[PDB]
Amino acid sequence: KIPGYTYGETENRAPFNLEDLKLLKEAVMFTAEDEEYIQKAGEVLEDQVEEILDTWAGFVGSHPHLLYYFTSPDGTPNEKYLAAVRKRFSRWILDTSNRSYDQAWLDYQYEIGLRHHRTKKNQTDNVESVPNIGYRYLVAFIYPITATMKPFLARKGHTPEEVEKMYQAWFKATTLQVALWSYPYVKYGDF
Amino acid sequence: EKIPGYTYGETENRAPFNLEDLKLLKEAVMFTAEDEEYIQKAGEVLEDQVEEILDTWAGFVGSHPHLLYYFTSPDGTPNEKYLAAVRKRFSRWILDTSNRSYDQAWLDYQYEIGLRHHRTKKNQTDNVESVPNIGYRYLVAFIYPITATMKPFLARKGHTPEEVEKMYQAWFKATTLQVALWSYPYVKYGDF
Ligand code: HEM
Ligand code: HEM
Ligand SMILES: [C-]#N
Ligand SMILES: [C-]#N
């Protein structure tokens, strides 16, 4: 198993539904063309995940105010926390590429938002760490997530056109997800 | 000659986020002095194309009833006065993003723009009757179509793909940065 990974088995139903999802996909310009290319992105990234995770960890770890969110109260990084999240983040790369974007997917998107937010942060791994990840950084991270993926998307010999389409699909899907993850952060009724 | 409703540098509130917050947020979006240079270049490329850009942007918003919704009168039809007034301020925002120093005045206006999408100030600037709040989910979503809209225009002055990529990436970073700041009035106090 992947510890803490509970896709399909969340305690809550998401507060957004399939119509909300359709409308949000429209807002990020996501179509059947992106369904095709996000799946291809999975195929390309799957065997590169260790290097992708090393790069992502390098980014977070190089900024004290970001590594902060994985620290124990004494200010030192909690390596068990980092390692447990790494395994779930690795799986998220595959889920983004392979899962149907349906009710189960929406339920887990609500869960991931809850886990960055004070509602559930630190509970999954039973760690003691900072209580909340400020929302400002969830939005900001859309950029470095896409920048991290981009070079890896070129490494299986796909055409420049195909690489660009995979990258754009990844950007749309990341944006879509972060928008959903805002739910527990947003003043009730303003989402 | 004054753009109605455009109050850059003269807003009523100091932003709740400061220049140190901004430094740290720039780090999170990988925005550096290099991007300052490339966003200025993007400005130079985009400036004389703004009418086409605005038509393209309006076309996207107008293409989906649930998006055009945010500019509608109670009868469900677009408020053309509202669209036209916002268009002029959006045109200016393209230039500001490219040309202003991201300093305290800039931060203060980012708080203002957030407040104007939010129920706090929406519809007050133009004194219109429209929908009370733009759901935050769409502000985040729109990071994508903003970048997709700018991309082809960034290539229309003969720059190489490598140069267009640097301008595009700078625009993407700067748009993300701004939407992150605009979340402030939407986010539960203490969670931003
Ligand atoms: C585009 C934005 C982001 C993406 C795509 C992302 C991705 C993920 C994923 C896939 C997980 C595991 C979800 C699961 O439990 O199955 C996770 C958890 C986590 N992320 Fe992020 N993340 C983002 C923003 C952030 C930011 C800004 C930080 C600040 C460093 C951060 C730090 C963490 C932490 C500390 C956890 C563990 C939360 C917990 O205690 O459950 N993430 N993230
Ligand atoms: C990346 C996201 C967005 C960007 C860059 C953007 C840009 C802008 C700008 C520059 C303005 C004028 C600011 C000023 O008053 O000086 C504005 C206002 C406005 N925008 Fe957006 N916008 C975004 C998201 C959205 C969304 C999702 C909608 C929904 C259709 C929307 C609809 C509106 C409306 C209705 C106004 C007028 C608000 C008021 O009553 O003052 N915007 N936007
Ligand atoms: C999150 N990493
Ligand atoms: C906003 N348009």
Residue numbers in the entry:
A (entry chain B): 5 to 195
B (entry chain A): 4 to 195
What does the study report here?
As a result of such increased accessibility, the tunnel 2 entrance site (i.e. roughly the cavity left by the Tyr→Ala mutation) in the Tyr(61)B10Ala mutant hosts a glycerol molecule (in both chains A and B; the glycerol molecule bound to chain A is modeled in a double conformation) which is able to H-bond the haem-Fe(III)-bound cyanide (distance of ∼2.8–2.9 Å, depending on the protein chain). Thus, in the Tyr(61)B10Ala mutant, the haem-Fe(III)-bound cyanide molecule is stabilized by the interaction with the Trp(60)B9 Nε2 atom (2.92 Å for chain A, and 2.90 Å for chain B), and by the additional H-bond provided by the glycerol molecule which mimics the H-bond provided by the Tyr(61)B10 OH group in the MaPgb*(III)-cyanide structure. Furthermore, the presence of the Trp(60)B9 side chain within the haem distal site affects the orientation of the haem-Fe(III)-bound cyanide, but does not impact on the ability of the adjacent Tyr(61)B10 residue to reorient its side chain toward the haem-Fe(III)-bound-ligand, as demonstrated by the structure of the cyanide-bound Trp(60)B9Ala mutant. Similarly, the Tyr(61)B10Ala mutation does neither impair the Phe(93)E11 ligand-sensing mechanism described above, nor ligand stabilization provided by Trp(60)B9. Higher accessibility to the haem-distal ligand-binding site due to the Tyr(61)B10Ala and Trp(60)B9Ala mutations may also partly contribute for the increase in koff for cyanide. off for cyanide dissociation from Trp(60)B9Ala MaPgb*(III)-cyanide and Tyr(61)B10Ala MaPgb*(III)-cyanide species are closely similar to those reported for cyanide dissociation from Mb(III)-cyanide and Hb(III)-cyanide complexes, where ligand stabilization is achieved through the distal HisE7 residue.
Protoglobin (Pgb) is a recently discovered haem-protein with distinct structural and functional features that make it unique within the globin superfamily. The MaPgb* structure can be considered as an expanded version of the 3/3 helical sandwich typical of “classical” globins (i.e. Mb), with an additional N-terminal extension, built by a 20-residue loop, followed by the Z-helix, which precedes the globin-fold conserved A-helix. Residues belonging to the Z-helix contribute to formation of the Pgb homodimer, which is centered on the intermolecular four-helix bundle built by the G- and H-helices of the two subunits. Thus, in Pgb the access of diatomic ligands, such as O2, CO, and NO, to the haem is granted by two orthogonal apolar tunnels that reach the haem distal region from entry sites at the B/G and B/E helix interfaces.
